[PDB]
Swiss-Prot record:
The record marks 26 as: Deprotonates C-terminal active site Cys. The record marks 33-34 as: Contributes to redox potential value. This is Thioredoxin-2. Keywords: Disulfide bond, Electron transport, Redox-active center, Transport. It comes from Drosophila melanogaster (Fruit fly). GO terms for biological process: cell redox homeostasis; determination of adult lifespan; response to oxidative stress.
Length: 106
């Protein structure tokens, strides 16, 4: 249930559509090794929590405006939004942190 936003407008639409569910933003790149290692674990968690969580992927190279808005420096960066509140954020391919943070926000 992972969807790649095409631009800022599309993200804003996806945010409003997600309503009160936890949104996980995965800031990634196609050249980023750790981003790909965590990819399968992310996909799993999105299916596992389909009825509570929306996972959006943001290719930093494609949506440079969004990466800049969220001040991405490290990759992957997971940003967690709930009703417009940026509730948590961390970076790195830390499977346990990713799972803990999701569960902590549902």
């Amino acid at each position: 249930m992972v969807y790649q936003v095409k631009d800022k407008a599309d993200l804003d639409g996806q945010l409003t559509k997600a309503s009160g569910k936890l949104v996980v933003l995965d800031f990634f790149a196609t050249w980023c090794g750790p981003c790909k290692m965590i990819s399968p674990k992310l996909v799993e968690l999105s299916t596992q929590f389909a009825d509570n969580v929306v996972v959006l992927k943001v290719d930093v190279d494609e949506c440079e405006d969004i990466a800049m808005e969220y001040n991405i420096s490290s990759m992957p960066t997971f940003v967690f939004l709930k009703n417009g509140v940026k509730v948590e954020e961390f970076a790195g391919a830390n499977a346990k942190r990713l799972e803990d943070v999701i569960k902590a926000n549902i």
